[PDB]
């Protein structure tokens, strides 16, 4: 009667989705063999034994799909829900949005149409794409437009990985990210901005893992998304809906860029020393260090915080801990939202994955905040773009695929519009 579709386009989102489906199959008892020895939100039934997950795995570079097409989990998916191309986007936009996308996005549309007519109470989409690669940017924009004009009414939530403040794995990041901002604003109703250096620091100081890797980050993101969809999947003493997320967190059609946080991200050793109550966990869930986007919440001003819990919890504990939180002086809200803390409870504790540095623990919180500090992030990225566009750097690589030059300035002013809004709403009366 209700389910979610999750798309994993690109090479980043697809690794995140690999880890995510790993964790999901682990928690619902679904063995990697499909045949198992509350889950209708994710997995459907192919009439016999094996439960097929709802997702499409798009990537033009067929390397990672071949990692999963013959890896440990190839028994699970549908061999048509693994779409691969024969080249890359080479990190530029138009080649993943004008020339090569033209062939593949139509097939993606047909497959998503089939998955839609298969399911009955679909409630939301979840695209998984970094904006660093030309795939996740151009393919992302094109598929987002195609869906927002095909389905429409349904909400959208993109777990998009941006380029970090200072570190990068590509030198042409500011270009093929700004061009996706136009797509992200209109068609992508919400956007759960994720970064890497934040989770890097989290791993480097919380879980004591000195030499982290992409798989650790992906396991953690998988845990976050499981915590998000807990209320839909599992039992709950006090539930929340994926439609209720939107109206509780979208004050205006053009300020909806939300960041996230999760707790307790604590290794085995340190868990031996922690109060473990709801008070300290919803206290640490507000510190800046464990905000999964490298921003400074001490500077901005929150607008609306939703909190999906899990594990045994007495609601009066949540009420008293939120009283203590709102009592803390250094944190401040806007005038037009005196009630900004939405709660939601579920009765499934975290799940452990063999090899996951997360210590098993009953209580767990996951916060998602629409705040106005995130604007600085955008502004930060803006700086990069400046010091490129003055010299038309790398521009011919874009014009060589049918993309008009002026698009860069247009998307630049489009993002300057956001840098105007997100520092216009956080103003007194």
């Amino acid at each position: 009667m209700r389910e979610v579709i999750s798309i994993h386009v690109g090479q980043g989102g697809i690794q995140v989705g690999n880890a995510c489906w790993e964790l999901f199959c682990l928690e619902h008892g679904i063995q990697p063999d499909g045949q198992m020895p509350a889950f209708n939100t994710f997995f459907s039934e192919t009439g016999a034994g094996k439960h097929v997950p709802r997702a499409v795995f798009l990537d033009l570079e067929p390397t990672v799909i071949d990692e999963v097409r013959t890896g440990t989990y190839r028994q699970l998916f549908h061999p048509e829900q693994l779409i691969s191309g024969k080249e890359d986007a080479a990190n530029n936009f138009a080649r993943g949005h004008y020339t090569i996308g033209k062939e593949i996005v139509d097939l993606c549309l047909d497959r998503i149409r089939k998955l839609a007519d298969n399911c009955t109470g679909l409630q939301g989409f979840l695209v998984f794409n970094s904006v660093g690669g030309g795939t996740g940017s151009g393919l992302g924009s094109l598929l987002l437009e195609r869906l927002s004009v095909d389905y429409g009414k349904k909400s959208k939530l993109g777990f998009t990985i941006y380029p970090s403040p200072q570190v990068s794995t590509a030198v042409v990041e500011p270009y093929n990210s700004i061009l996706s901002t136009h797509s992200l604003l209109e068609h992508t109703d919400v956007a759960v901005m994720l970064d890497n250096e934040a989770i890097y620091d989290i791993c480097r100081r919380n879980l004591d893992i000195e030499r982290p890797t992409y798989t650790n980050l992906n396991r953690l993101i998988a845990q976050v998304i499981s915590s998000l969809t807990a209320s839909l999947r599992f039992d709950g003493a006090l539930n929340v809906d994926i439609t209720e997320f939107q109206t509780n967190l979208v004050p205006y059609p053009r300020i909806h860029f939300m960041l996230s946080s999760y707790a307790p991200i604590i290794s085995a050793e340190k868990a031996y020393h922690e109060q473990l109550s709801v008070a300290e966990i919803t206290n640490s869930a507000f510190e800046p260090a464990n905000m999964m986007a490298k921003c400074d919440p001490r500077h901005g001003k929150y607008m609306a915080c939703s909190m999906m819990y899990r594990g045994d919890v007495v609601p009066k504990d949540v009420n008293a801990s939120i009283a203590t939180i709102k009592t803390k002086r250094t944190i401040q809200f806007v005038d037009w939202c005196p009630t900004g803390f939405k709660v939601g409870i579920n009765y499934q504790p975290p799940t452990v994955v063999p090899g996951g540095d997360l210590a098993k623990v009953m209580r767990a919180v996951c916060m998602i905040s629409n705040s106005t500090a995130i604007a600085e992030v955008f502004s930060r990225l803006d700086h990069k773009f400046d010091l490129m566009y003055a010299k038309r750097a790398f521009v011919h690589w874009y014009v060589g695929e049918g993309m008009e030059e002026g698009e860069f300035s247009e998307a630049r002013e489009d993002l300057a519009a956001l840098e105007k809004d997100y520092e216009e709403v956080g103003i007194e009366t």
Binding site: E61, E87, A170, P212, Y214, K391, W397
Partner: protein, 420 residues
């Protein structure tokens, strides 16, 4: 999927190609009989793996020299199309007379190899800038194929004249005649010089008796490591085109320096550790690169680093950040995060780590300065010209070629200083 055609040319190109196929064989586990005990080779009925290549030269002696050494049985007996008369190191010999009478069949067999694939991602050339055969027939074949396939990419692993001594006293003329046509129709000009490889195999390995086999083995390791993050899995994969965008900001400034790591002698191998710090230090080491231009005397427009091995990533990113925030002066600042990283999941046979470094810097402009200097000197005296006009070529071309060269460096130095 995403194959690579192996065009050769010149005796240096042929030797380096033989060594490169040797390395690819004992990495992919192909014994020199051609069995296993699509990116490069081609399946062949009977259980053989014939390497997709082509060998061109105006002397059929290199034929027997390359078939004599091991791993020569891999090359099919049909690709060995060779000319008769020989060019004797005369650009016009290998570019106008012998070119226009064998390059026809060269293009024919190249097309035959091309359509046989499904996605010919890019080309691959092994040749020289000095010899008439190598330089001439190579630039002509490159012009022809880039008129043929305007969609694919180009790359030439070219050896250039060493600064101290020269191999063929007319090196400047053939060099400039190859660069006047290469700069227009080529994307990745991986420059190498014999003196840098000499200094590498002596200083950093204590090998007292280097032979061209060993030097070709080093450049083989470099060429392999270039793309090895493609035909293997990896936590972050790249290819021969993500490089091109992460490397060239402009249609001209696309001439790359090359480096490999790790390399150490017998003595110093017991002591030194092996972790991302040491690999980075050898990577950005001045003498470790294979270019006769200390990069410290310029800057980098950009640089990429393809690691290999199942290792961490935070070390990678934090050391990129460190090497960029400490050596910021020697980097250029009008671009953000001017380095690019890539990671694979298989190190070379016999280690647990590797680095292949590629750099689009502004330090080879000095090399082009010295080449233009040599050209002007040996040109104002018309030295060695009646060979270059007795074969249907006017001096006019020569002149304009140097002009083009000027413009080239006229760009590089410029972007070295301009800021915003």
């Amino acid at each position: 999927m995403r194959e690579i055609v192996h065009i050769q040319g010149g005796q240096c190109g042929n030797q380096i190609g033989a060594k490169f196929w040797e390395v690819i064989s004992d990495e992919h586990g192909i014994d020199p009989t051609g069995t296993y005990h699509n990116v490069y080779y081609n399946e062949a009925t009977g259980g053989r793996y014939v390497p997709r290549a082509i060998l061109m030269d105006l002397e059929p002696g290199t034929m027997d020299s390359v078939r004599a050494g091991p791993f020569g049985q891999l090359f099919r007996p049909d690709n060995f199309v060779f000319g008769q008369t020989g060019a004797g190191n005369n650009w016009a010999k290998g570019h106008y007379t012998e070119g226009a009478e064998l390059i026809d069949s060269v293009l024919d067999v190249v097309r035959k190899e091309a359509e046989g694939c499904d996605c010919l991602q890019g080309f691959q050339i092994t040749h020289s800038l000095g010899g008439g055969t190598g330089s001439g027939m190579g630039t002509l074949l490159i012009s022809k194929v880039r008129e043929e396939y305007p969609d694919r990419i180009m790359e030439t692993f070219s050896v250039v004249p060493s600064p101290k001594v020269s191999d063929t006293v007319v090196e400047p003329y053939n060099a400039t005649l190859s660069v006047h046509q290469l700069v227009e129709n080529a994307d990745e000009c991986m420059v190498i010089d014999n003196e840098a490889l000499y200094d590498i195999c002596f200083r950093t390995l204590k090998l007292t008796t280097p032979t061209y086999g060993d030097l070709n083995h080093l450049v083989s390791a470099a060429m392999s490591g270039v793309t090895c993050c493609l035909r293997f899995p990896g936590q972050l994969n790249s290819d021969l085109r993500k490089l091109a965008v992460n490397l060239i900001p402009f249609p001209r400034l696309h001439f790359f320096m090359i480096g490999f790591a790790p390399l150490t002698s017998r003595g110093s191998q017991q002591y030194r550790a092996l972790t991302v710090p040491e690999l980075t230090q050898q990577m950005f080491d001045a003498k470790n690169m294979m270019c006769a231009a200390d990069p410290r005397h310029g800057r980098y427009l950009t640089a990429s680093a393809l690691f290999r091995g199942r290792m961490s990533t935070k070390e990678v990113d934090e050391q990129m950040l460190n090497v960029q925030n400490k050596n910021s002066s020697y980097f250029v600042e009008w671009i953000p995060n001017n380095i690019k990283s890539s990671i694979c999941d298989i190190p070379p046979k016999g280690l647990k780590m590797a680095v292949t470094f590629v750099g689009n810097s502004t330090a080879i402009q000095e090399m082009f300065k010295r080449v233009a200097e040599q050209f002007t000197a040996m040109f104002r005296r018309k030295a060695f010209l009646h060979w270059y006009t007795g074969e249907g070529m006017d001096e006019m071309e020569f002149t304009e070629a140097e002009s083009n060269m000027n413009d080239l460096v006229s760009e590089y130095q410029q972007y070295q200083d301009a800021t915003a």
